[PDB]
Design a protein around this nucleic acid. Structure first.
Length: 66
DNA sequence: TTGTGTTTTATGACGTCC
DNA sequence: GGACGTCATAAAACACAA
């Protein structure tokens, strides 16, 4: 049992650089990237799902209004 | 330190789509 | 179908005032 794993900065770099392109992932690029960053398509799926919840959580607060 | 507060992987529940 | 989307949540991993 291994609950979690941290991702190399290079994996986090590329992953993040795609989020900038689209907050959503084509099954092509899901798999195209999965392979070039050596990670399960299911992973690149959840990372993008999670990444959005961050932008959502930042953006909510960036509504400081005050 | 350290303890405590936030950030990063990850899963299951349930929902939407022609 | 059957792929993905949101979630509430858990726990490893990290950051950093006292």
């Amino acid at each position: 049992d291994k609950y979690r794993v941290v991702y190399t900065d290079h994996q986090r770099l590329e992953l993040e650089k795609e989020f900038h392109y689209s907050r959503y992932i084509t099954i092509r690029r899901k798999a195209e990237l999965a392979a070039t960053l050596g990670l399960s398509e299911r992973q690149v799926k959840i990372w993008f799902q999670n990444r959005r919840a961050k932008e959502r959580k930042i953006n909510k607060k960036k509504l400081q209004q005050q």
